[PDB]
Amino acid sequence: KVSRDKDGSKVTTVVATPGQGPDRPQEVSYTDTKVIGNGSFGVVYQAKLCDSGELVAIKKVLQDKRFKNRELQIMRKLDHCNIVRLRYFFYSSDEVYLNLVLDYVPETVYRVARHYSRAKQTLPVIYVKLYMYQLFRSLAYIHSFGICHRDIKPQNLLLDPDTAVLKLCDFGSAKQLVRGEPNVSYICSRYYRAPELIFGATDYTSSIDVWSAGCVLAELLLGQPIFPGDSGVDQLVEIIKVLGTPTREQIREMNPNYTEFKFPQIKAHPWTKVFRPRTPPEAIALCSRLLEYTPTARLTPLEACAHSFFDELRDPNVKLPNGRDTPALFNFTTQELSSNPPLATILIPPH
Amino acid sequence: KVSRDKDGSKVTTVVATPGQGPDRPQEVSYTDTKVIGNGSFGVVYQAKLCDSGELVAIKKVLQDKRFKNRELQIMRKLDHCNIVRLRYFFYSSDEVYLNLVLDYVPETVYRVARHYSRAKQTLPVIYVKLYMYQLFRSLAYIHSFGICHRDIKPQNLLLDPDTAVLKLCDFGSAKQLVRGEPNVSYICSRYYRAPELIFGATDYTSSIDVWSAGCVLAELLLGQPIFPGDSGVDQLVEIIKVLGTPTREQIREMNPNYTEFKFPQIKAHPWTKVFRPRTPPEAIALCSRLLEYTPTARLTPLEACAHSFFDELRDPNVKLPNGRDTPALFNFTTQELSSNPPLATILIPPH
Numbered sequence: 001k002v003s004r005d006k007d008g009s010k011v012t013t014v015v016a017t018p019g020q021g022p023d024r025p026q027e028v029s030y031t032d033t034k035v036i037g038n039g040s041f042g043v044v045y046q047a048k049l050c051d052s053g054e055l056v057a058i059k060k061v062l063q064d065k066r067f068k069n070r071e072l073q074i075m076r077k078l079d080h081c082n083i084v085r086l087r088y089f090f091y092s093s094d095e096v097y098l099n100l101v102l103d104y105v106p107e108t109v110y111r112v113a114r115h116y117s118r119a120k121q122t123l124p125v126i127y128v129k130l131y132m133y134q135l136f137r138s139l140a141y142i143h144s145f146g147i148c149h150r151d152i153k154p155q156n157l158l159l160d161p162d163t164a165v166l167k168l169c170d171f172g173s174a175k176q177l178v179r180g181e182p183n184v185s186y187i188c189s190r191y192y193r194a195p196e197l198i199f200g201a202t203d204y205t206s207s208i209d210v211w212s213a214g215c216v217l218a219e220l221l222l223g224q225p226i227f228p229g230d231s232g233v234d235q236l237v238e239i240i241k242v243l244g245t246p247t248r249e250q251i252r253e254m255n256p257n258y259t260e261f262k263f264p265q266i267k268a269h270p271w272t273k274v275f276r277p278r279t280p281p282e283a284i285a286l287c288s289r290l291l292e293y294t295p296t297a298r299l300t301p302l303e304a305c306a307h308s309f310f311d312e313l314r315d316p317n318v319k320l321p322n323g324r325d326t327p328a329l330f331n332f333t334t335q336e337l338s339s340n341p342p343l344a345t346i347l348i349p350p351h
Numbered sequence: 352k353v354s355r356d357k358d359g360s361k362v363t364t365v366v367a368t369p370g371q372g373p374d375r376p377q378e379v380s381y382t383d384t385k386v387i388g389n390g391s392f393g394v395v396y397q398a399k400l401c402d403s404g405e406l407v408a409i410k411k412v413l414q415d416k417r418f419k420n421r422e423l424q425i426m427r428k429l430d431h432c433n434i435v436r437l438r439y440f441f442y443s444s445d446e447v448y449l450n451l452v453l454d455y456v457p458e459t460v461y462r463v464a465r466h467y468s469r470a471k472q473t474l475p476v477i478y479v480k481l482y483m484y485q486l487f488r489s490l491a492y493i494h495s496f497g498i499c500h501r502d503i504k505p506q507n508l509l510l511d512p513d514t515a516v517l518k519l520c521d522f523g524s525a526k527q528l529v530r531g532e533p534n535v536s537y538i539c540s541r542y543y544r545a546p547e548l549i550f551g552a553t554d555y556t557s558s559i560d561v562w563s564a565g566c567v568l569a570e571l572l573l574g575q576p577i578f579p580g581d582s583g584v585d586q587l588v589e590i591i592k593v594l595g596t597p598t599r600e601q602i603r604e605m606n607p608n609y610t611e612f613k614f615p616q617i618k619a620h621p622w623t624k625v626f627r628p629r630t631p632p633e634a635i636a637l638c639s640r641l642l643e644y645t646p647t648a649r650l651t652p653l654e655a656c657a658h659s660f661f662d663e664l665r666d667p668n669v670k671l672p673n674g675r676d677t678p679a680l681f682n683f684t685t686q687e688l689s690s691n692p693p694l695a696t697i698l699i700p701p702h
């Protein structure tokens with residue numbers, strides 16, 4: 001159903017299932033359609049809902065009729081203030097496309113960082129704390145369902161510049177990780193790719209996401225990627241140039257069925273001397289606890305939220321630089337705290 | 352067959368079909384096996400052939416029994432001094448892997464450029480001429496067969512630093528283009544991706560490779576990528592920021608069935624002000640003739656070989672900076688010249 005309204009604007013009307021809530025298809029109309037993204041899957045559009053005037057992002061992906069879509073399945077489960085909301089899904093055009101209608105968010109962490117980096121400046125630490133904290137919250141939430149994003153990178157961190165609200169997006173790499181069931185090794189954007197994946201692990205856990213979050217924190221502190229690999233395995237060289245050569249124990253912790261990379265012995269660089277001189281030590285300390293070789297040695301998302309780097313966010317007096325209140329930071333559900341309930345005492349300040 | 356030699360070394364023995372020459376499988380033994388690369392396809396190994404002591408790269412790709420492998424088919428046709436030679440292929444271990452045994456080449460153009468850029472210098476122009484000339488030769492060769500590489504980027508330009516010999520590698524994206532038969536639009540590493548592909552063209556030609564080669568030339572002159580997109584469509588913004596907004600004629604030349612990107616009108620940037628002040632004009636001029644929006648307006652690889660930027664390579668007196676002779680540059684076959692035979696009078700100096 002494509003029509004023209006009062007003036008002469010192109011209105012598209014589709015039958016779409018609500019993203020969350022009852023499985024009751026309804027007519028949804030939108031206009032002002034334009035391409036804002038693309039990839040192996042297909043295209044991302046900006047559009048405006050006719051009823052409410054609200055901007056949405058529509059991800060359009062080729063669908064194997066017989067094959068069930070993993071991304072749709074995951075997006076239908078999720079309901080969290082730091083994950084972009086699936087509003088609706090619908091099918092369109094001898095092949096069929098799934099269309100995911102999402103809340104539109106006008107910026108990304110990547111673009112905000114590039115603005116600073118292109119001017120050889122760094123993001124003020126308060127922005128770093130707000131973004132990194134909300135990402136760790138989204139990760140606690142999805143990891144509590146056994147769901148691993150597997151593509152944490154600055155481009156998939158949407159933000160409202162005015163409220164400083166962050167939304168995790170692009171669940172196209174996401175998977176429910178099940179003990180015993182192998183996972184693909186070539187996964188995640190290279191710079192953010194956990195060392196176990198480079199060692200070809202198929203038995204990895206949700207902790208590959210914490211490594212990625214570590215790479216994002218480090219990038220925001222440095223003003224450039226901490227591990228800029230030219231390839232999958234040169235990525236490992238770059239990591240070793242900072243963390244040093246991993247021990248046989250660490251390598252076994254990463255992939256117990258690995259083959260020979262036979263790279264030379266390099267000593268670790270001191271963490272503090274990786275970052276610029278005035279970098280806050282609590283920031284550097286959090287980085288060291290995220291970017292551990294041994295996956296089980298990495299802080300959990302909930303633990304990362306409790307780190308002293310975020311202490312400033314739990315100040316009753318804290319405000320955004322633009323003067324407005326901080327967004328919702330402390331309204332933790334049961335599900336969010338499920339990994340370690342007692343952490344609440346730290347994660348929820350007195351008043 | 353995995354065995355131990357005179358000393359106690361791990362020798363692997365496989366039955367492999369010669370890359371070129373008769374379909375006659377023979378025993379091939381190799382040792383000193385190590386991972387040098389990986390990707391969606393699988394893993395790349397270094398190994399040493401036991402008989403000859405020669406270093407090879409072994410690309411190992413998962414093989415669908417029912418599907419015939421496009422990459423193998425193409426590699427078996429190719430025999431050129433600037434394309435990495437398929438020596439052998441063999442199958443290994445309930446799933447089956449194709450192993451492509453290739454000549455080992457110890458550097459890439461990308462790594463050589465990074466060495467200079469990381470020191471805030473540029474590659475001397477003579478290296479730029481040598482690399483770009485050999486790339487255009489490999490492209491003239493494969494394009495003469497209707498074969499398009501579709502992943503031209505500095506990482507896929509292997510070189511022997513001593514002889515300055517360049518070998519095109521990674522034919523994992525390569526395809527014989529047939530008029531009428533659609534090709535995938537999401538293809539090529541983003542920075543090198545021709546504008547028609549971003550407009551979602553499925554009837555592009557081998558000229559997408561010349562656009563990529565232009566992006567490589569520009570990067571070698573600049574010390575960084577000329578079009579650093581954060582995404583598929585932001586790639587187009589970055590291009591427009593230099594070339595300006597394309598005309599409706601150029602857009603139609605790129606994809607006659609395209610959709611709304613609805614981007615702002617931006618005026619072209621002067622070519623000479625993109626590059627550093629002492630950039631040779633013949634280099635900038637060649638770049639302008641490669642990075643044309645209208646695909647048919649792009650120089651052919653053979654035409655690009657005949658450009659005045661390469662005049663220095665046809666000097667009887669020219670030598671490598673290390674003092675050694677220039678490699679074979681002028682031993683063009685008939686097949687190579689097939690796109691425009693008369694260009695020989697320029698391409699093959701009397702000496």
Ligand SMILES: c1cncc(-c2nc3ccc4ncc(N5CCSCC5)nc4c3o2)c1
Pocket residue numbers: 036037038039044057059084102103104105106107108158169170171172
């Ligand atoms: C590629 C693969 N998988 C998902 C996505 C995607 N999901 C969203 C949700 C919401 C979005 N809202 C806005 C937006 N833009 C405008 C702001 S700058 C990035 C593009 N982009 C969005 C987006 O992109 C993209």
Ligand SMILES: c1cncc(-c2nc3ccc4ncc(N5CCSCC5)nc4c3o2)c1
Pocket residue numbers: 387388390395408410435453454455456457458459509520521522523
């Ligand atoms: C990815 C996808 N498809 C193919 C390839 C590939 N083919 C070759 C051939 C020969 C090679 N020789 C050497 C080499 N190294 C050592 C030098 S630095 C890059 C890795 N790498 C090679 C290579 O990689 C990689």
